[PDB]
């Protein structure tokens, strides 16, 4: 018996309840990035960069 | 018996309840990116970059 | 018995309930990208980049 | 202008999300009453008795 | 302007999220009453008795 | 302007989130009453007795 890498559980979300009562919600953007409202998200990345709510700017590599 | 990589569970979302009561919701954009409202999302990436709510800017590589 | 890569479960979403009562919802865009309202999404990518709600800007590679 | 009994809201249920993951569920009865699983119920009774999940016994009025 | 009995809100339930993960659930009865699992219930009774999860016994009025 | 009985709010439940993870749940009864699991319940009774989770015994009025 080996059971190598067995019965695992990774990058998991479960059993979540959520209520949101918002009368108004404005998001104005005129520049770079804006990220909002990220709920119950799961990921598993192998041999790579893993981002989930990454608001980056502008990569301005010139000459 | 090996059971190598067995009974696994990865990048999973389950058992989620959500209520959202919003009277108004405006999103104005005139520049780069805007990401909103990302719920119950799962991913598994192998040998690659994995992004989920990544609002990037503008990659301006000149000469 | 090997059971290598067996009974797996990856990039999965299940058992999700959602209610959304929004009286008004406007999205104005005049620049780059806008992503909204992404619910119960699953993906598995092998040997590749995997994006799910990625609002990118404009890749302006000149000469 | 009277607006007597106006814009009322009574005996109301709205905006409800629910998830139930039950692997087994047995209900054995051999006597009186059993009531189970009552969700999102509304009632308005006028000039009367109003019951909603009332498990009564046995009304044994003899001579 | 009277607005007598106006813009009222009574016996109301709203904006409820619920998750229940039960592996087993047995209810055995052999006598009187059993009431279980009553969620998001609303009532308005006028000129009457109002019960919602009332498990009564046995009304044994003899001679 | 009277606004008598106006903009009221009575017997109300709202904005409730709940998670319940129970591996086992048994309810055995052989006598009178049993009441369990009463969530997010509202009532308004006028000119009457109002009970919500009332487990009574057995009213044995003899001669």
């Amino acid at each position: 018996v080996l059971y190598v890498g067995s019965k695992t559980k990774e990058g998991v979300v479960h059993g979540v309840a959520t209520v949101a009562e918002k009368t108004k919600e404005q998001v104005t953007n005129v520049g770079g990035a804006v990220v909002t409202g990220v709920t119950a998200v799961a990921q598993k990345t192998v041999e790579g960069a893993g981002s989930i709510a990454a608001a980056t700017g502008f990569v301005k590599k010139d000459q």
Side-chain angles (χ1 to χ4, degrees), chain A residues 25-39:
Chain A
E25 175 164 359
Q26 169 195 344
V27 169
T28 314
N29 184 233
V30 296
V34 165
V35 171
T36 299
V38 173
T39 319

Side-chain angles (χ1 to χ4, degrees), chain A residues 5-53:
Chain A
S6 170
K7 309 176 184 302
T8 299
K9 194 158 190 182
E10 46 200 356
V12 173
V13 172
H14 74 85
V16 176
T18 304
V19 174
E21 304 182 15
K22 309 186 183 205
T23 302
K24 184 182 180 292
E25 175 164 359
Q26 169 195 344
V27 169
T28 314
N29 184 233
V30 296
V34 165
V35 171
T36 299
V38 173
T39 319
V41 176
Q43 169 185 16
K44 183 161 192 312
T45 289
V46 177
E47 218 298 335
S51 300
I52 289 176

